Amino acid sequence: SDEEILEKLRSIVSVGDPKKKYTRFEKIGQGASGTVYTAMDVATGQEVAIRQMNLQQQPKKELIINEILVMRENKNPNIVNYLDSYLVGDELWVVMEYLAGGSLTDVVTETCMDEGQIAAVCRECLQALEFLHSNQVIHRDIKSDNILLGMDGSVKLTDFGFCAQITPGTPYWMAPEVVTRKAYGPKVDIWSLGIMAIEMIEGEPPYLNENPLRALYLIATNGTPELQNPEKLSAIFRDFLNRCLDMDVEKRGSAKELLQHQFLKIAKPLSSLTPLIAAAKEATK
Amino acid sequence: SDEEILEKLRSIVSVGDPKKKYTRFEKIGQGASGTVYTAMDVATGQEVAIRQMNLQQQPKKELIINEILVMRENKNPNIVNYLDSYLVGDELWVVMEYLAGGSLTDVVTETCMDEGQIAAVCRECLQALEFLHSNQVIHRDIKSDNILLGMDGSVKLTDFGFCAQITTMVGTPYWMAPEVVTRKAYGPKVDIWSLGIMAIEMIEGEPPYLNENPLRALYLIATNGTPELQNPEKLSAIFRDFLNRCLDMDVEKRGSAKELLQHQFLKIAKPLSSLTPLIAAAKEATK
Amino acid sequence: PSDFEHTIHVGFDAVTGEFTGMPEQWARLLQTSNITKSEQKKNPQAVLDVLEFYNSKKTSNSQKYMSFTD
Amino acid sequence: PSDFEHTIHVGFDAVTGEFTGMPEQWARLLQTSNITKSEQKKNPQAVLDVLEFYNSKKTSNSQKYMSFTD
């Protein structure tokens, strides 16, 4: 249906000349997924990311079309959203939001987050997950590299599909049922969230000083990693981490249920992250 | 797709509650396969078996469902048939025929069967195999333990699927054919082979390879084919011909169920009722 | 080590605390990873499941696409 | 779909009357199988076919279900 795929796109792609609708293009990267540029919507000022795809000379495409069909009808402030798509000659242009700033990863390693800050980003991530799940979407890669932080402290979840891949080791974030090849569901994201929360408080990944296979083994049997000083953490937080890191999938908290968790109530303002983000952006490059 | 699993079910499950159409429930076994009781059909008095399984906690569900689709459109007197299937709350209740009495195994170790008697049981088993093979089913476990005997002498084949278990896995699978034991591709004729072995078991009063090491026995089946009979001299020429047609190592030369139903050996059979006093003496020696 | 072709299925002898029919690679990753004998005895399936996952995480390619529920 | 099984090649040396490249557990099994040296040389392939069958039965948690023809 190489001619039918070109027909379906036409019913989804939007009108207009993206070369007119967007300005200040800037090549960020280039690969098999196509060429990516950051740009700005002339009318609204909205900063965006444009993926120019090779089209014809690019693998499976009605899966890409499937995401478009799914995400174009659903939006959320906590996930990198799909804005528009265009057809320019022999190419396909996908436009996504682009959040300036840094990664939670850089913020975790260079600075020291507190439970107020951790609780703030967990709520934002929970909101994104609750939204993605209600849409029958499993992220599968919830980790510090996939959550974007605006200088605003605002939080966005990315890399949950082809369209929203990161514009530019061991599975430490994967759940037991994943590492053991079992059938899994949405809750594997809750597990990953717990791991992320742990990474934040430790300012470092789970299994750094461990062989890959052994780490997988530990995840499959011990479940939660070991904290250097579990006592320091509070009761509501540990309780939070426990609802997230329960091996019994069905006793494990869900996104919705976890929104109501007391730990979030202790959240600080996202603006509280600005100096950490700023400080983090200074070092790395 | 645990959503269609229920669609299929509710489209073949019967209307009504088992607690009304059946009575006199009495638990038999208990395991992962489920909880099986022995009940009776209130109306017709038909004796049955009810396997109360653990629904959502039962592995392969699309298989069981497929078994019920096959055996619901096809019945035969020489096999444990499928009667009904129900949805009691969350569970899936499968109703199977139940036959009181014992098993060929107990008759075999406790008594001495003659040729007329063996011929009779062989005919019934062959009828059951002709049926199962016509519906593309390979039993794989034709042995005395899986042949149920009515106090009547009546014969039913069991254990050819999930919905028909006990309503061995240690030692040697003395009934399997050379092509099975050497892991080659095989077909329905492996049941003909097992039948021939069951017949030897019946005339000798015990299964072959009893004192053999599992591996040596397997090697022997793969090379010698047939087990060493204790008293060949005593077997009639017609019974030996019959055994030879069942136990040919060459699959193509081996008889099929349909061909063997016409074998002369089956013609000297005694009436199934000749088994009654053997079955009684066996079950009184407790079994 | 030549002639007849055969397939061998992995096994675990609980009494000796050792896997049987383990392919060369797997046997190598196992002893170097320091997965103890006791841990193996504790959940052999998990150990095999993890070995599988590991050596499969060398085949699939980075190109990630949307994953949906059932 | 056993990703827990792999192909192996075993040979037999008629002079010494010994298999080559024999899995260690298969070698231990053959040792106390009571299958003689002669019998082993008479039909080496049968010996290996039999060991493979034993292995496949020992390592499967196969519950029985209705099986059909091809």
A-C contacts (CB, under 8 Å): 81
- Is B141 one of the annotated active-site residues of the chain? yes
Q: Please check whether residue D28 touches C, CB under 8 A.
A: no
Say what the resolution is, in angstroms: 2.3
Annotated active-site residue in B2, B17, B41, B141: B141
Give the closest-approach CA distance of C4 to chain B in angstroms. 13
D21 contacts in chain C (CB < 8 Å): 1-2
Dihedral (C-alpha) A29, A31, A34, A38: value to the nearest 10 degrees? Answer: -10
Structure tokens at A174: 């994967």
Helix axes B115-134, B189-204, angle to 10 degrees: 160
Considering only CA atoms, which of D64, A132, D43, C4 is closest in space to residue B159?
A: D64
Residue ranges per structural domain of chain D: 1-70
According to CATH, what is the number of the domain A99-284? 1.10.510.10
* Chain position carrying tokens 């891949």: A165
> What is the separation of C-alpha B165 from the centre of its chain, rounded to a whole number of angstroms?
9
Structure tokens at A119: 């609780």
**Angstrom distance (rounded) from CA A268 to CA B80:** 69
Whether domain B99-287 has CATH 1.10.510.10? yes
Q: Please check whether residue C8 touches D, CB under 8 A.
A: yes
Rg of chain C over CA atoms, in angstroms?
A: 16
The 3-state secondary structure of A60-81 reads CCCCHHHHHHHHCCCCCCCECC
Structure tokens at A169: 């080791």
Query: Which chains contact A through at least 3 pairs of Cβ atoms less than 8 Å apart?
Result: C
Question: Which CATH superfamily, name and number, covers B1-98?
Answer: Phosphorylase Kinase; domain 1 (3.30.200.20)
The β-bridge relationship of strands B22-23 and B34-41 is antiparallel
**Angstrom distance (rounded) from CA A182 to CA D53:** 28
Give the closest-approach CA distance of B181 to chain D in angstroms. 6
**Record: contact D23-C3, CB cut-off 8 A:** no
Residue of B nearest to D43 (CA): B223
Residue of B nearest to C70 (CA): B1
**Angstrom distance (rounded) from CA B257 to CA B136:** 13
The 3-state secondary structure of B117-140 reads HHHHHHHHHHHHHHHHHHCCEECC
Considering only CA atoms, which of C28, C29, C32, C10 is closest in space to residue C20?
A: C10
CB atoms within 10 A of CB A106: 21
**Angstrom distance (rounded) from CA D43 to CA B182:** 12
Considering only CA atoms, which of B212, B202, B211 is closest in space to residue B246?
A: B202
Who contacts A255 (Cβ-Cβ below 8 Å, separation ≥6)? A126, A129, A130, A133, A186, A189, A190
β-partners of residue B79 are B157
Considering only CA atoms, which of B161, B167, B234, B229 is closest in space to residue B197?
A: B229
Considering only CA atoms, which of A131, A254, A247 is closest in space to residue A190?
A: A254
B2 contacts in chain C (CB < 8 Å): 70
Nearest CB partner across the interface for C4, out of D2, D23, D45: D45
The DSSP H or E segment spanning A102 is strand A102-103
According to CATH, what is the number of the domain D1-70? 3.90.810.10
C69 contacts in chain A (CB < 8 Å): 133, 136-138, 185-186
**Record: contact D9-C11, CB cut-off 8 A:** no
Q: Which amino acid is at A258?
A: L
Burial of residue C38 (CB within 10 Å: 0-12, 13-18, 19+) is exposed
Is residue A97 within 8 A of residue A48, CB to CB? The reply is: yes
C70 contacts in chain B (CB < 8 Å): 1-3
CB atoms within 10 A of CB D7: 9
Q: Please check whether residue D18 touches C, CB under 8 A.
A: no
Residue ranges per structural domain of chain A: 1-98, 99-284
**Angstrom distance (rounded) from CA A278 to CA A272:** 11
Q: Which amino acid is at C51?
A: L
Structure tokens at A154: 């605002």
Active site residues of A: 141
Considering only CA atoms, which of B243, B166, B252, B257 is closest in space to residue B208?
A: B243
**Angstrom distance (rounded) from CA C29 to CA C10:** 15
